[PDB]
Design a protein around this ligand. Structure first.
Ligand SMILES: C[C@H](O)[C@H](O)C1=Nc2c(nc(N)[nH]c2=O)NC1
Ligand SMILES: [Fe+3]
Length: 307
């Protein structure tokens, strides 16, 4: 059985296991030829590297150029939310603007966003350097911990990022983690991953892809976006609710093995009935994963109980 954290503090073992040679080092990355950007990214990476569970997340003074990039992303995406985003998203967005500084001229600090999430559903953020393995990333969800990037995409291409960046974390993920039902759903994915065989970790990562990242959900007689990948992509958010893509009901035995690529708009999306239902489906799917035990998270002591 693969090792897995049993206490929320044990998530600290993660920072010592990310891909050390990240996307920003690639020749085609938007900021590759910019040495200031490179040092700026290493600076955020260092903050994540020295972070330890329990500490407040360091505040960072963003530069005028970074604030501009965020402003561009914020304003163009905001125009789509009232009509394309699920109810849960629009319900919390005003509070985020009011209490977390979500505005075109201000990049929210992760500590404030984390405290806000903790008050809503007990979810918290932890700054992360680069890409964690799926096992470690999903594992954190079992503790209602979301590993979040703090850096921003290069200013030369505000509408493009080959990786998650702070605009994607805050405008895409954070609002759904504010909802109790979604929080419980995400956590169920994380619980399923604890000690699971690598082959199932990949199946759960695919389920995660088709829900948390690119999920569509029923809302009364309508359909809305809730996946963070869609909610932070201006082009795909509009495309996903048009007649072009194919839509199928969320069905984990099929979803878990569906192939996808991360470079074009998704040709197929899965539609959840609701977060409680997706949660139930994950729970059932998790029972099929060969694990010599069951797991339960105890929020009172922040430890995972193994049986
Ligand atoms: C999205 C994919 O299916 C999978 O769950 C992962 N997501 C992420 C990851 N690592 C980071 N840093 N951020 C993510 O959003 N590793 C694996
Ligand atoms: Fe994401």
């Amino acid at each position: 059985v693969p090792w897995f954290p049993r206490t929320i503090q044990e998530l600290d073992r993660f920072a010592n296991q990310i891909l050390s040679y990240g996307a920003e080092l690639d020749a085609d990355h938007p900021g590759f030829k910019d040495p200031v950007y490179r040092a700026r990214r290493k600076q955020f990476a260092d903050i994540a590297y020295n972070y330890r569970h329990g500490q407040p997340i360091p505040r960072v003074e963003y530069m005028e150029e970074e604030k501009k990039t965020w402003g561009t992303v914020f304003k163009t995406l905001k125009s789509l939310y009232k009509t394309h985003a699920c109810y849960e998203y629009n319900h919390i967005f005003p509070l985020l603007e009011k209490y977390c500084g979500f505005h075109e001229d201000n990049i929210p600090q992760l500590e404030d966003v984390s405290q806000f999430l903790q008050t809503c559903t007990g979810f918290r953020l932890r700054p992360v350097a680069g890409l964690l393995s799926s096992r470690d990333f999903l594992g954190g969800l079992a503790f209602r911990v979301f590993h979040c990037t703090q850096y921003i995409r290069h200013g030369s291409k505000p509408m493009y990022t080959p990786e998650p960046d702070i605009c994607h974390e805050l405008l895409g993920h954070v609002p759904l983690f504010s909802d109790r039902s979604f929080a419980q759903f995400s956590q169920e994915i994380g619980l399923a991953s604890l000690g699971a065989p690598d082959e199932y970790i990949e199946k759960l990562a695919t389920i995660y892809w088709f829900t948390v990242e690119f999920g569509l959900c029923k809302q009364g007689d309508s359909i809305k976006a809730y996946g963070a990948g869609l909610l932070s992509s201006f082009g795909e958010l509009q495309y996903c609710l048009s007649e072009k893509p194919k839509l199928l009901p969320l069905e984990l035995e099929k979803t878990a093995i569906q192939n996808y690529t991360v470079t074009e708009f998704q040709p197929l999306y899965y539609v959840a009935e609701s977060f409680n239902d997706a949660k139930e489906k994950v729970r059932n799917f998790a029972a099929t994963i060969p694990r010599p035990f069951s797991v339960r998270y105890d929020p009172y002591t922040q430890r995972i109980e193994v049986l």
